[PDB]
Write a protein that binds this ligand. Structure first.
Ligand SMILES: O=C(O)c1ccc(O)c2ncccc12
Ligand SMILES: [Mn+2]
Length: 201
């Protein structure tokens, strides 16, 4: 059992990937990818956008979920059908049939992009899982435990892999190591990851 509460579904989204990527591009045509600035003043190497009713974003030197994209002053694009359906199939298979995300954060990793170790604790109910979908180039996902200094474990996440982070794992510190450059036939030179969240109360 790699991470208590987590359910790894390798290649679960492999068949859906081309459609998912088309929908990423459609979302980004409305709410573009942008590299947000952390509360500490650093520009993230990962570029982000969102779809759904709520979107994860910097605002006033903190993080929060907002119904409005600060870059466009318009709502985030609606949740694509492909996104909704894939998430529900994965969550249901993993034992979370009532998971109803209202936010999907879309991350784009260019070579060298990384995410420092952190917890996702900005959501109102931490009993709801987060569903992660990997597309394109492979990345090393690192995760520890409930404490910042718990022992780290690592696993490669490859194109089409889905992880449902539930139970205890929902609160683990985690991150992504600097992305290795390469080629993928559907994303060309990057990785994307979708993370579905229940962000509304
Ligand atoms: O699955 C991933 O690649 C991933 C990457 C970066 C994150 O901040 C995440 N947060 C929660 C769940 C998954 C992820
Ligand atoms: Mn995270």
């Amino acid at each position: 059992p790699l991470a208590a509460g987590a359910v790894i579904l390798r290649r679960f989204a492999f068949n859906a990937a081309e459609q998912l990527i088309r929908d990423i591009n459609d979302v980004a045509s409305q709410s573009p990818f942008r590299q947000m600035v952390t509360p500490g003043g650093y520009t993230m190497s990962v570029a982000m956008t969102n779809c759904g009713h709520l979107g994860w974003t910097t605002h006033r030197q903190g993080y929060l979920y907002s119904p409005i994209d600060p870059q466009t002053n318009k709502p985030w694009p609606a949740m694509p059908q492909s996104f909704h359906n894939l998430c529900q199939r994965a969550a249901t298979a993993a034992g979370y049939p009532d998971f109803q995300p209202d936010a999907c954060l879309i991350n784009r990793y260019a070579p060298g992009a990384k995410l420092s170790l952190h917890q996702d604790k900005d959501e109102p109910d931490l009993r709801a899982p987060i569903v992660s979908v990997s597309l394109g180039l492979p990345a090393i996902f690192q995760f520890g435990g409930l404490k910042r200094n718990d022992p780290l474990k690592r696993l490669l996440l490859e194109h089409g892999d889905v992880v449902v982070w539930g139970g205890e794992s929902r609160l683990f510190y985690h991150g992504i190591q600097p992305l290795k450059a390469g080629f993928h036939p559907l994303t060309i030179d990057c990785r994307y990851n979708l993370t579905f969240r229940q962000a509304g109360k």
